[PDB]
Amino acid sequence: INFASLAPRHGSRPFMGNWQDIGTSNMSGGAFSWGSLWKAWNSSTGQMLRDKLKEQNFQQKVVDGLASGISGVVDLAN
Amino acid sequence: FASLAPRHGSRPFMGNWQDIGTSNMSGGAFSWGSL
Amino acid sequence: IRVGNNFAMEINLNANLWRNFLYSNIALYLPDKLKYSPSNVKISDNPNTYD
Amino acid sequence: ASQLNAVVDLQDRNTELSYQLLLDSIGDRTRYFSMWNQAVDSYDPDVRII
Amino acid sequence: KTAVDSITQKKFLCDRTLWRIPFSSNFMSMGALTDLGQNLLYANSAHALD
Known part of the structure; x- marks a missing residue:
């Protein structure tokens, strides 16, 4: 009775997730990551478009799926 | 061991053994967090 | 002395701005089949030139 | 030492697109990086x- | 230079929100089941609220 064969294998080693992860959330005291980070009267054109581009995309730190990027330092916005 | 590491304490600062890595566009990812 | 109201002229502003924006940024990029050729003005026979 | 090339570039790969992704x-x-013209x-x- | 005398008004707006008054000793969120919730007086008796 071992279920390791069902899991994805990360190379001679099953990819067993942390057992400490079973959901629990309520009104106060429960906070989850990935927060809400974010005819022109004004013709600047430029920053405007750029800003719209920014508005449609993303950035944060626990986004560590895969890799952070080369040489390093550990930072915030936890 | 290693003496070549930043030491934030008397104890050395060393990451996880398992740190070497991969991703193919594929979706061979779409995988979870560092946590 | 002016009798009655002052002479004046009217123009819709927001409509004009929207019309300019739309006409430029969409109309000037429709497929050439909807476009035509002007009158009395020489134009390149090659369709790929800037002219 | 040995003239054998170490880069075997087929014509099925699309390296530019792979680097983009x-x-x-x-x-x-x-974000914009002017060094490599990183302006998507x-x-x-x-x-x-x- | 010819400004008239003035009187200040202050008001604040807070929409899309709910005021909260947690039932905890120090108002902190020390957990879902607040200690005052487990306080024996509130647990083994009856009371009236006004």
């Missing part, structure tokens, strides 16, 4: 979608 995956192309092409959504 890798750049998107590792970082975020929304984009369009005004109010133009594409009226």
